[PDB]
Every structure is written in structure tokens, then in C-alpha cells.
Swiss-Prot record, chain A:
Belongs to the TRAP-beta family. TRAP proteins are part of a complex whose function is to bind calcium to the ER membrane and thereby regulate the retention of ER resident proteins. Keywords: Endoplasmic reticulum, Glycoprotein, Membrane, Signal, Transmembrane, Transmembrane helix. GO terms for cellular component: endoplasmic reticulum; endoplasmic reticulum membrane; membrane. GO terms for biological process: cotranslational protein targeting to membrane; in utero embryonic development. It is found in: Endoplasmic reticulum membrane. Glycans are attached at residues 27, 43. The chain crosses the membrane at residues 87-106. This is Translocon-associated protein subunit beta. Its main location: endoplasmic reticulum. Residues 1-86 are lumenal. It comes from Homo sapiens (Human). Heterotetramer of TRAP-alpha, TRAP-beta, TRAP-delta and TRAP-gamma. Interacts with STING1. It is a single-pass type I membrane protein. The chain holds residues 62 to 176 of 183 of the full protein.
From Swiss-Prot, chain B:
Glycans are attached at residue 48. Shows a remarkable charge distribution with the N-terminus being highly negatively charged, and the cytoplasmic C-terminus positively charged. TRAP proteins are part of a complex whose function is to bind calcium to the ER membrane and thereby regulate the retention of ER resident proteins. May be involved in the recycling of the translocation apparatus after completion of the translocation process or may function as a membrane-bound chaperone facilitating folding of translocated proteins. Seems to bind calcium. The chain crosses the membrane at residues 57-77. This is Translocon-associated protein subunit alpha. Heterotetramer of TRAP-alpha, TRAP-beta, TRAP-delta and TRAP-gamma. Interacts with palmitoylated calnexin (CALX), the interaction is required for efficient folding of glycosylated proteins.
Curated annotation (Swiss-Prot), chain C:
This is Protein transport protein Sec61 subunit alpha isoform 1. Residues 20-25, 75-121, 185-212, 300-303 are lumenal. Residues 47-53, 143-163, 234-278, 321-329 are cytoplasmic. Expressed in proximal and distal tubules in kidney (at protein level). One of its GO terms (cellular component) is Sec61 translocon complex. It comes from Homo sapiens. One of its GO terms (biological process) is pronephric nephron development. The chain holds residues 120 to 471 of 476 of the full protein. It is found in: Endoplasmic reticulum membrane.
Curated annotation (Swiss-Prot), chain D:
It is found in: Endoplasmic reticulum membrane. Residues 24-29, 123-128 are cytoplasmic. InterPro entries: SSR3. This is Translocon-associated protein subunit gamma. It comes from Homo sapiens. PANTHER family: TRANSLOCON-ASSOCIATED PROTEIN SUBUNIT GAMMA, TRANSLOCON-ASSOCIATED PROTEIN TRAP , GAMMA SUBUNIT. The chain crosses the membrane at residues 3-23, 30-51, 101-122, 129-148. Residues 52-100 are lumenal. Pfam families: TRAP-gamma. Belongs to the TRAP-gamma family. Heterotetramer of TRAP-alpha, TRAP-beta, TRAP-delta and TRAP-gamma.
């Protein structure tokens, strides 16, 4: 429940999932894709896990690891730090500054050299 | 992290054995330090067992055989001169 | 000197460089007195006998050079035992090979051993050292000459400019570093202590290859003062040598010796061209060599080789004269 | 001298080009930063046009020194009645290419200065500081270089 | 401009005239270098060899106090 829907959109996966059985010496992997809606520091707290250790046994409550406090970068700040194609488009934009003299200089030289 | 009674927690830890530790046996000790609400400190040795650049190759071992190319050239231009003491 | 040594000896006895200042016994103060007084004075009178030509000149030079011979080359072959915390290892880096061969099939790893050992370090440092040792003889043997008149010539001394400075150049930096550490933005230090912050850290010598890999930009700052002192602050050694134009001129007038071609008197202006220019490759590049070696890691050599092998040269030309007496006879 | 209008029509161009990448990778605020942009472009156009004139004026003579023999050859191949063609055409013949190279070199010089400052020195600095120092240093240094 | 050059002129003259002088002055010596070459290593090694053996008396004599 650590991810309120007002701050994180669920894109894929579930914050709540149940499995009928996990065999001994077996494992299950679950993946959730969220989308943070606001930049800032967020605390990735542990999730809660409940299970029965034996049939008709007491419910055992466990917790996952906590990744801890992570920074959600603002999209503008991410782009400022890691923004490719900008140079691809920029390269051509610089050419026109010297179009006239570049051609004329050599044309005159050839006419006199 | 507070662990209430009859609950469990799980912690991920990761470390990197130093590069010079290749080929050696070491005692790996992993301790978990925890205390009660009364302030009694407890420690559990959860694990206490004995657990068992290409520039390096380029920058001489490879290139020595190219220094030898200089040698083969100059040894030609030196030792080919040894054709001037036959006898009549 | 004698009294300055005694003063130093008393200062560290008062410090108790080893031992609490009374409980081991005051008689060790007498012991240290006799020890150092005798040792130093005898050593000096050795150097005097040599300069008196029962030897050749300076002994102390040759002595420290021999110490350098040991402290370098001993580590090549000394079969004395070392332990990592693995078991039986050897000091003499090279010969370990023969026991590794009996230990492992892993020839490639046996060779990488030549590149690994971090303490009493691996052979690759020795190999660099050897290469430096070999190369320098090229530079030092060069010399230049002028005709002299009452078929004879004065050899213009060349690397004589290199002989004196580097001692001072290294010392001044090392000492100001030590001072700043003791007195304390200027500088902050990690554990051999080393700088890790302040100007002194931007100033610090990037001896580690790791320092190369982490940041090249830093190294310029170290170069700027370390080399620039050789470029400019050295210039004053005309007085230290006592060899400005109007000094060398005086010396040669005491010699009463004159060149061909132009006047004794204008010979000041004649020799001026040669006098400042001697300071260039005659001196500064020996520092550049020193730093080359040191950052390549040539063991203790960027001090040692410079003097030691020059002394080997001097001893060689002496050996030539005498033994060539044998060879001619 | 009145030809300086062309210099004014040329010196401003390069001063403003980097705005694209600055808005794309440095994400500069074009509204707030317009204060800096206007001043930078105006100063650059002023001194750079003055440099254009200085470079061409200082070097135009060499063009005639080199090729005036050829230009005379073609002039005649086409003394008072003969010299008039020299004043009408030859002087401009040297001038024309002298200007073209002067402007060409000045513009070629400008690019590297900004590239080095922004993407090799001011990498570790605020985009505001990045643009300020990069462009201001480029303009001042390049104009001083032209006076060299 | 030239007043700015004044800073350059000492650097240029000292470097360039120094190199001219050096090469005009100290012409190569390679063959006699070959004559000294072997003796360089021989003398280096044999004079080091002095201490390389003299050390061997002292390590175990240190046992008189230390190696207990």
C-alpha cells in the first residue's frame, strides 16, 4: 500500500497479489510497473506478505526488503542530465552562417588561380 | 527496522570480494545486530563458515615481438656484412 | 655539523623516539651519545681519507649509492620468506617463479604474478626500473668542450647543473607539506599519511596509475609547480654553484687560462651564451626523468639512480684510467 | 567604409545559433534568458564586425602583392588611358576575396571557442553559468584574438 | 601587440637557441658508448653484490636480542 494512486499511476502489475501455494525450496517473482506522477524524494518502504505456514495454522506476517528513500528526478532535470538526436538536428542548423563567403572565396581564387 | 512479535523481516545485503582475493579461502562472517525494547543488544552470526585489462597482455608480451621486427631488420643490415673474409 | 648532529640526537632522546624518557634507564642517553658521536665523526673522517686520495674523493656519495644498490636490487633475488596470509612466499620476486612452476599448471597466472604482487611489489616494477637504469646512461655521458690556452681543452660541465637542485626541489615540497599537515581550505589528509582534500590535495603528486585513470586534469597542477621550479626557481643556483659569468671568469683568471679567438676580457660576453642555457636540459629534464620513473613506479629510483648511476659513471672513468693502466701494461 | 553594413549583416549570425541545444540539452528558459541573449548578440555583432574590417584591412594588400601581376595581365589582355581600369577594378579585385577570407576565418574561429567552453569546461556548471561564461568568454577572447 | 610578445620572446629564444647550441655542441658517442655499456652493468651488479652478500651475517645475529 506504499504507493498512493494520486502520486503513482499503475501502468502494469499489482501492488496486491495472492498465491495459493509456494512449494518448499521454490520461489515466485512478481513485477509491478508504476509511473511516478510527481518528482521528489520517495521512500520505497517494504511490502507486507501474509501466508499460512501450516494447514489451519496461524497467519504469519512478513515484510519484504525496503529499498529505502529514492529520488524521483523531474523530467526536465533528467533530460538536462542525460539528454542524443538534439545534436543530430543541431549540426545542420550551423551551416548557413558561412554559405556565401565560403563559396565566393574559392570561386574568386579559381577565377584568379 | 522494528520487527513486532510473531512477524518476520527480510533484508538484502550485497558485497564485493576484493580482486586480490582470487584463489584464497576466507572465513565469511555475517552478523545481524538487533536489540529488544529494553536496550539489550544481541548479535547473531547468521553465517560463520570458511568459503573458498587486456592492456596488461598488450603493453609488453604482445609488443616484444614487434621490437623483434626492428631486430630482424637491423640484424640483416649488420650480419649480411659478414661476406668479406673468404680467401683466394 | 658535529654539534648540529648532537643537538638532533638530544632532541629525539628527549622525545624518546624509542622508549619512555626514564623507565628504560638514563644510561641509554649516554649510549646514544657515544653511538652517534663516534659513528658520524668516523664516517666523516672516512670521506676525508678518500678525498685525501688514499681513496678518490667523496665516500659518502659512494656509500649511499651502495645502499641504493642493495635497497633496489636485493629485492630481485633475496630468498627470504614472506607471508601474505597464504603460506610460504619469498621476498626475491624473481625466483618465486621456480616454485610456482612446481605449484601450478597455470603458467598464464604465474606470469600475471609478475604483474600483481602489491607489497615487495611485482616484477613489472623491477622491469621498469631496469629500463630506466639502462636509459639514463645515454643522457649522462654527454659533455662539451672548449679549447684553452696558457691541443688542450676545457670540458664544459653539463649535468653538473643537475647534481645539486633536485634535493632542494623535492625537499621544499615535502617539508611544506609536512608543515601544513602539522599546523592544521589549504589541506586535509587521510592515512604514510596522504592528502585527500584542500589545495594540497589538488597539489598532491598523482603517483598512482589509478590517479591517471580517475582524473588527468589534476596532474597539471602538480606539474606546474614541480617542473616550474626547475624552470625558474632554479635559476638562482648560479650563486649556489658560484658559477655566474663573472664567477667562472674569476675562477679561470685564477687558473690564468684563456681561449683562442677573442679576448680574455670579452670572454665574459662569449661564455654568457652558454651559461644560462646550461640550466635547461642539463637540469630540468633530469627532474622530468625522475617523475617518469616514480610514476612508472621504479623502486625508490627517481631519487637513487640519478646520483647513484652518475657516481657509477665517475667510478667508471676512474676505473678506466687505473685498470687501463693495467690493460696498456 | 560604407560596406560595413554587410559586416553588421554577418557578425550577429553565429552568436545566437547555440540556443537550440541550450533549450534542448541545457533546457534554458528562453523568456528569462532573453535578457542575456540580446546583450550577448549585440556585443558580438559590434566587435566581430569591427574585427572583420580589421583583418581584411590589415591583409588586403597581400592579395595585390601576390596576384596583381595576373590581374594586370588579364586587364591588358582584355599609360593614363590604361591605368583607369586599375582603380575601377583591380583594387576591388584584391578587396573582394580579402573580405571573403576575413569573414570566413573569423566565423571558423568562433565555433570551437564556444564548443570547448560549454562542453569541456562548463560541463560541471549551472546552465545559467554555462551560457553566461561560454558566450561572454567567446566574444571577448575572440575579439582580442582578432586584435592579435 | 609586440609588448604582449615581450613575454613570449624569452621563452622562444631560450628554448630555440638552447637546442641549437646543444646539438651543435654534444655530437653522438655511440660506439664508445658500446665500450662502456657492458661495464655499466658489470660494475652496477658487482658493487651491489658486495652488500648483497654482506647482509647475510646480520639477519641471524639479530637473533641475539630479537629472535627469541
Amino acid at each position: 500500500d506504499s504507493f498512493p494512486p494520486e502520486d503513482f499511476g499503475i501502468v502494469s502489475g499489482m501492488l496486491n497479489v495472492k498465491w495459493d501455494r509456494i512449494a518448499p525450496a521454490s520461489n515466485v517473482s512478481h513485477t509491478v510497473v508504476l509511473r511516478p506522477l510527481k518528482a521528489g524524494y520517495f521512500n520505497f518502504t517494504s511490502a507486507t506478505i501474509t501466508y499460512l505456514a501450516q494447514e489451519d495454522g496461524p497467519v504469519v506476517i512478513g515484510s519484504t526488503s525496503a529499498p529505502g528513500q529514492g529520488g524521483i528526478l523531474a523530467q526536465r532535470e533528467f533530460d538536462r542530465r542525460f539528454s542524443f538526436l538534439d545534436w543530430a538536428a543541431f549540426g545542420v542548423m550551423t551551416l548557413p552562417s558561412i554559405g556565401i563567403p565560403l563559396l565566393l572565396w574559392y570561386s574568386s581564387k579559381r577565377k584568379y588561380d | 527496522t522494528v520487527v513486532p512479535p510473531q512477524r518476520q523481516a527480510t533484508f538484502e545485503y550485497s558485497f564485493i570480494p576484493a580482486e586480490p582475493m582470487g584463489g584464497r579461502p576466507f572465513g565469511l562472517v555475517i552478523n545481524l545486530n538487533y536489540k529488544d525494547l529494553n536496550g539489550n543488544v544481541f548479535q547473531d552470526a547468521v553465517f560463520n563458515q570458511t568459503v573458498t585489462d587486456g592492456e596488461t597482455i598488450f603493453m609488453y608480451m604482445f609488443l616484444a615481438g614487434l621490437g623483434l621486427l626492428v631486430i630482424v631488420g637491423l640484424h640483416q643490415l649488420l650480419e649480411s656484412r659478414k661476406r668479406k673474409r673468404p680467401i683466394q | 655539523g658535529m654539534i648540529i648532529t648532537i643537538g638532533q640526537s638530544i632532541v629525539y632522546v628527549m622525545t624518546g623516539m624509542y622508549g619512555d624518557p626514564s623507565e628504560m634507564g638514563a644510561g641509554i642517553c649516554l649510549l646514544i651519545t657515544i653511538q652517534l658521536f663516534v659513528a658520524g665523526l668516523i664516517v666523516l673522517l672516512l670521506d676525508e681519507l678518500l678525498q685525501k686520495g688514499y681513496g678518490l674523493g667523496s665516500g659518502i656519495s659512494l656509500f649511499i649509492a651502495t645502499n641504493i644498490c642493495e635497497t633496489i636490487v636485493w629485492k630481485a633475488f633475496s630468498p627470504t620468506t614472506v607471508n601474505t596470509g597464504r603460506g610460504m612466499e619469498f621476498e626475491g620476486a624473481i625466483i618465486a617463479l621456480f616454485h610456482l612452476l612446481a605449484t601450478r599448471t597455470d603458467k598464464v597466472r604465474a606470469l600475471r604474478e609478475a604483474f600483481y604482487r602489491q607489497n615487495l611489489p611485482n616484477l613489472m616494477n623491477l622491469i621498469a626500473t631496469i629500463f630506466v637504469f639502462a636509459v639514463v646512461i645515454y643522457f649522462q655521458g654527454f659533455r662539451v668542450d672548449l679549447p684553452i690556452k696558457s691541443y688542450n681543452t676545457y670540458p664544459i660541465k653539463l649535468f653538473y647543473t643537475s647534481n645539486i637542485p633536485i634535493i632542494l626541489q623535492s625537499a621544499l615540497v615535502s617539508n611544506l607539506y609536512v608543515i601544513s599537515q602539522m599546523l592544521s581550505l589549504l589541506g586535509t589528509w587521510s592515512d604514510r599519511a596522504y592528502p585527500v582534500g584542500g589545495l594540497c590535495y589538488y597539489l598532491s603528486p598523482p603517483e598512482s596509475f589509478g590517479s591517471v585513470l580517475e582524473d588527468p586534469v589534476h596532474a597539471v597542477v602538480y606539474i606546474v609547480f614541480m617542473l616550474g621550479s626547475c624552470a625558474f626557481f632554479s635559476k638562482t643556483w648560479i650563486e649556489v654553484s658560484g658559477s655566474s659569468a663573472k664567477d667562472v671568469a674569476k675562477q679561470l683568471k685564477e687558473q690564468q687560462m684563456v681561449m683562442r679567438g677573442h679576448r680574455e676580457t670579452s670572454m665574459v660576453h662569449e661564455l654568457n651564451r652558454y651559461i644560462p642555457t646550461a640550466a635547461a636540459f642539463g637540469g630540468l629534464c633530469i627532474g622530468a626523468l625522475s617523475v617518469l620513473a616514480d610514476f612508472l613506479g621504479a623502486i625508490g629510483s627517481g631519487t637513487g639512480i640519478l646520483l647513484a648511476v652518475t657516481i657509477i659513471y665517475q667510478y667508471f672513468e676512474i676505473f678506466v684510467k687505473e685498470q687501463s693502466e693495467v690493460g696498456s701494461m | 567604409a560604407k560596406s560595413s553594413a554587410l559586416f553588421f549583416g554577418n557578425a550577429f549570425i553565429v552568436s545566437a545559433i547555440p540556443i537550440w541545444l541550450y533549450w534542448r540539452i541545457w533546457h534554458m528558459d528562453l523568456i528569462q534568458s532573453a535578457v542575456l541573449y540580446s546583450v550577448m548578440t549585440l556585443v558580438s555583432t559590434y566587435l566581430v564586425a569591427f574585427a572583420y574590417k580589421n583583418v581584411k584591412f590589415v591583409l588586403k594588400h597581400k592579395v595585390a602583392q601576390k596576384r596583381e601581376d595576373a590581374v594586370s595581365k588579364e586587364v591588358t589582355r582584355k599609360r593614363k588611358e590604361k591605368d583607369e581600369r586599375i582603380l575601377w577594378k583591380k583594387n576591388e579585385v584584391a578587396d573582394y576575396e580579402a573580405t571573403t577570407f576575413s569573414i570566413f576565418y573569423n566565423n571558423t574561429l568562433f565555433l570551437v571557442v564556444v564548443i570547448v567552453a560549454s562542453f569541456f569546461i562548463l560541463k560541471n556548471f549551472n546552465p545559467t553559468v554555462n551560457y553566461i561564461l561560454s558566450i561572454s568568454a567567446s566574444s571577448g577572447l575572440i575579439a582580442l584574438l582578432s586584435t592579435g | 601587440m609586440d609588448q604582449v610578445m615581450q613575454f613570449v620572446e624569452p621563452s622562444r629564444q631560450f628554448v630555440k637557441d638552447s637546442i641549437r647550441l646543444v646539438k651543435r655542441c654534444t655530437k653522438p658517442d655511440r660506439k664508445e658508448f658500446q665500450k662502456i655499456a657492458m661495464a655499466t652493468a658489470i660494475g652496477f651488479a658487482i658493487m651491489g653484490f658486495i652488500g648483497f652478500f654482506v647482509k647475510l651475517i646480520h639477519i641471524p645475529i639479530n637473533n641475539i636480542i630479537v629472535g627469541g
